[PDB]
Write a protein that binds this ligand. Structure first.
Ligand SMILES: *[C@@H]1O[C@H](CO)[C@@H](O[C@@H]2O[C@H](CO)[C@@H](O)[C@H](O)[C@H]2NC(C)=O)[C@H](O)[C@H]1NC(C)=O
Ligand SMILES: *[C@@H]1O[C@H](CO)[C@@H](O[C@@H]2O[C@H](CO)[C@@H](O)[C@H](O)[C@H]2NC(C)=O)[C@H](O)[C@H]1NC(C)=O
Lengths: 82, 49
């Protein structure tokens, strides 16, 4: 784990828990009143390109008591650096 | 005189409930753009007791 973080200053919160992961993985991220809520669901997808037709609920997964003025976000990849 | 107990005095707007601000930057108190130069109409919000 040495992706981009190089000047990590003194900070507050750290946490570790179980890993999450033709797999349709759906996640919902919410930020209300300094609280971070994460819901998730995993299904076996068999459709070619886009979302399927049906219905499937999402269970609550994690809550975090951290207050951040979040405005933007990005996805993290692991390219074949070789 | 204990001057370690300081607090932020000036800010652009109010705060949402239960959050913290650690922005140690010059605040423009008027029409003069501080631009990291301080001066008139520019104050350091953190001041002690
Ligand atoms: C620990 O966090 C505090 C909270 O900001 C840092 O205090 C100031 O940090 C700024 C950088 O944004 C410096 O320019 C100031 O000189 C710091 N004030 C001090 C040291 O009294 C502090 O720097 C952080 N600790 C470290 C090692 O970076
Ligand atoms: C969270 O950060 C954003 C960063 O843009 C803040 O949005 C700015 O807030 C100031 C406050 O006076 C406004 O003057 C700007 O016009 C806002 N810019 C944008 C692009 O929205 C936002 O206020 C922050 N949330 C807080 C402080 O609760």
């Amino acid at each position: 784990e040495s992706g981009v973080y190089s000047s990590a200053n003194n900070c507050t919160f750290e946490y570790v828990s179980q890993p999450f992961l033709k797999n349709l993985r759906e996640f919902v991220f919410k930020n209300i009143d300094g609280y971070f809520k994460i819901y998730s669901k995993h299904t076996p997808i068999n459709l070619v390109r886009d979302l399927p037709q049906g219905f499937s609920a999402l269970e609550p997964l994690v809550d975090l008591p951290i207050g951040i003025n979040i405005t933007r976000f990005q996805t993290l990849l692991a390219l074949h650096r070789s | 005189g204990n001057y370690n107990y300081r607090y932020r005095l000036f800010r652009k707007s109010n705060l949402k409930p239960f959050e913290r601000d650690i922005s140690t930057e010059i605040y423009q108190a008027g029409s003069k753009p501080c631009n990291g130069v301080e001066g008139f109409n520019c104050y350091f919000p953190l001041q002690s007791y």
